[PDB]
Structure formats: structure tokens, C-alpha cells
Amino acid sequence: LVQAYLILATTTFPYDEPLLANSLLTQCIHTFKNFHVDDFRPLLNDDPVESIAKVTLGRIFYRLCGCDYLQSGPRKPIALHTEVSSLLNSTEVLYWKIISLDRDLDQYLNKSSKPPLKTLDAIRRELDIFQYKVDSLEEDFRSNNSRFQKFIALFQISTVSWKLFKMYLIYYDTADSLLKVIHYSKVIISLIVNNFHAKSEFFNRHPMVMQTITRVVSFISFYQIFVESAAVKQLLVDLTELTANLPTIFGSKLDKLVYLTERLSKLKLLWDKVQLLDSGDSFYHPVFKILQNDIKIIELKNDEMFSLIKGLGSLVPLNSDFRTIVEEFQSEYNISDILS
């Protein structure tokens, strides 16, 4: 069961059926913790069949905490990765270290406490170490498995680098950090576009190039809304051209990403044609209220209280130009068109 789900989670199965994949992952955590292995190291005393079995459970546990992280929503409450330590064969543990560093970065999204500078610097030193480790993986060009291996390692370490320098740009605004964000975005583009010129077009179907491109094109659109720059505009044109040329096997999620990029493009026009107000310390603008409500609508949709009220029986739930522009833009480009 655990092996079949870890094969299925290398596709877009955990995004076409997210609640079913979360229940399958809860069953996989239940089936994995059933065996009660607290140490995945080959001990000398045991049977050398049981040592191979514990090596197998180590390399399955790495992929299982990877798929545990990649579904860390509010519709998946039971965690496996809490029983692992943190950083603050020999190539599968590399993906584990990079995904754990990505988790240590992206855990600061939903919480309000901004991370320290020493934490991001320690992540930066470890990032440079694993960048040297990924750049040292030798590969045969005729052996396509090792090429796809190096692509996965290099794309994951570039995604972690981009998220680290995005957190530098956001949480502290360190001098000469926007250049590093643009640099690693161009690295991601130069990785994905390279696969069209080597007849290995299926490399761009792995689900990390949907997640990463979603984060990158949404952040570059959101930054081109407010702070204009010519390099950011050329980067946004490159992101839009790349988003139009991602493979068709993503299907609905690709078209919803194109819709989200188009909506954040129209929001720039709305920011331009409407003048910013103030209140001395507080600032008012329709773009600000629309971006408030885009979070509020989806927090209302991921509120499972209404399904609880429908499940408990006969309980039926009984629930200037500023507001005009906001309601017309929400009627025209609704945020609930990215849902399924």
C-alpha cells in the first residue's frame, strides 16, 4: 500500500483527488508506523535480510515524509514528519535533505512570526553545501535515468534557493537580493526550457515544475504589480511564455495557473488606473481589499464547519467607487475559478 501510493504520488494524483490522497496518506502513515521501526540503520547483530528490510524502510520513509510535506494542507492533519529530527543509497537522502530544507523554509508562510537572520543564514550555508553536492553528481548522457536524476536534484535545489532569496527580499529587504531572486528565476527557466531542446520533454511533467512555476509566476506578477523594473518585466514575459508551454498532462491546473497570472496582470491595470489613498498610518486601495478577499473566500471554502452542519442532520445553515470597483472586479475575475 505504501509503495503503491508513493508510486502514485509522483504523478498528479495528489492534486486531482486531494482528499482521497490525504486519506491514502493517512493510511500509509498508519501502515508504516504499524511496523514500529525507530532506527533505520543496518545493525551488525540482525539477520542480513532484516538489515536490507530496514534499509528499504529507510528509503521508503524518506519518500513518505517527502509526500507528507508535499500535502501539508489543512485537509491533512495527521503528520509523520514530526517524528524526524531537523538540520537546524546516497542520492535519495539528497532529495530528502533538500525537501526538508524546503519545509524549514515554507513553514513560515501560515504563521505570523518572521524568521531570524541567523536562521536564514544557516539555511544559506547549508544551501551552498547542497548546491556543491548537486553540482558534483556525474551523469551519462546516454543513461537517461541519471539525467532525470540530476534534473530533479538541480531543480529542487534551485527552488529552495529561490524561496530562500524570496524570504530575504520579503522579510528583511537585504541590499542586492532582488537580483538573486531574478537570477534563480532565470535558472528555473533555463532548466525547464532546456528540456525542449534535448528530446527529453517528459522531464517537465514531474509535479515540482508545476508547484515551483506557480510560486514563481505568482510572485513575479505580484511584484510587477507594485514595484516596476525592466528586468522584472522581461522575467514576467519569460514566465508567461513558459507557463503557456508547460506540458498538457497537467490539464486543468495549468489553465487555472494561466487564469491566476492573467488575474494578477489585470490587477496591475487596476492598480495603475486607481490612485492610492491614505489615513496617515493606514493606506486604502481597492487592490488591497481585493487581495484581502481572495484569502477570505478560500478560507471560507476550506472551512469544513458547513460540511459538519450538513452531516449532523436537520441542522441547516442560515448564513463610493471603492466598493463598486471591488465588486465589479470580483464579479469579472472571480477568485473561485481556480477551484474544482
Which parts of 238-277 interact with other proteins (CB under 8 A)? 253, 256-257, 260, 275-277
Residue 83 vs 128, nearer CB to other proteins: 83
If we measure between CA atoms, which residue out of 177, 180, 169 comes closest to residue 114?
A: 169
Phi-psi region of 161 (alpha: psi -120 to 50; beta: other; left: phi over 0): alpha
| CA 308-309-313 angle, 5° bins | 110
The reply to whether 34 sits near other proteins by the rule CB under 8 A is: yes
Residue 128 vs 174, nearer CB to other proteins: 174
Q: Which residues contact 291 (CB under 8 A, 6 or more apart)?
A: 267
Q: How far is the CB of 329 from other proteins (least distance, A)?
A: 15
The reply to whether 184 sits near other proteins by the rule CB under 8 A is: no
Q: How far is the CB of 111 from other proteins (least distance, A)?
A: 9
Give the DSSP letter of residue 56. Answer: H
> Among 85, 113, 314, 331, which residue interacts with other proteins (rule: CB under 8 A)?
314
Per CB under 8 A, which region of 71-79, 126-134, 179-187, 237-245 contacts other proteins? Answer: 71-79
The reply to whether 187 sits near other proteins by the rule CB under 8 A is: no
Residue type, 74: P
Residue 128 vs 296, nearer CB to other proteins: 296
> Among 144, 243, 265, 334, which residue interacts with other proteins (rule: CB under 8 A)?
144
> Among 90, 113, 282, 331, which residue interacts with other proteins (rule: CB under 8 A)?
282
The reply to whether 170 sits near other proteins by the rule CB under 8 A is: yes
Q: How far is the CB of 41 from other proteins (least distance, A)?
A: 15
Give the Å distances, CA to CA, from 159 to 7, 38, 106, 155, 270. Answer: 22, 31, 11, 6, 30
The reply to whether 35 sits near other proteins by the rule CB under 8 A is: yes
The reply to whether 295 sits near other proteins by the rule CB under 8 A is: yes
Task: Count interface residues toward other proteins (CB under 8 A).
Answer: 109
Give the Å distances, CA to CA, from 161 to 193, 218, 240, 309, 339. Answer: 19, 17, 21, 44, 29
Ranges within 197-226 binding other proteins (CB under 8 A): 202, 211, 214-215, 218-219, 222, 226
The Cα diameter of the chain in Å comes to 78
Q: How far apart are alpha carbons 151 and 288 in whole angstroms?
A: 38
Residue 20 vs 128, nearer CB to other proteins: 20
Ranges within 106-135 binding other proteins (CB under 8 A): 108-110, 114
Structure-derived torsion over alpha carbons of residues 225, 231, 233, 236, reported in degrees to the nearest 10: -100
Q: How far apart are alpha carbons 161 and 47 in whole angstroms?
A: 42
The reply to whether 171 sits near other proteins by the rule CB under 8 A is: yes
Q: How far apart are alpha carbons 179 and 37 in whole angstroms?
A: 46
Q: How far is the CB of 127 from other proteins (least distance, A)?
A: 19
Q: Which residues contact 319 (CB under 8 A, 6 or more apart)?
A: none
Q: How far is the CB of 15 from other proteins (least distance, A)?
A: 5
The reply to whether 95 sits near other proteins by the rule CB under 8 A is: yes
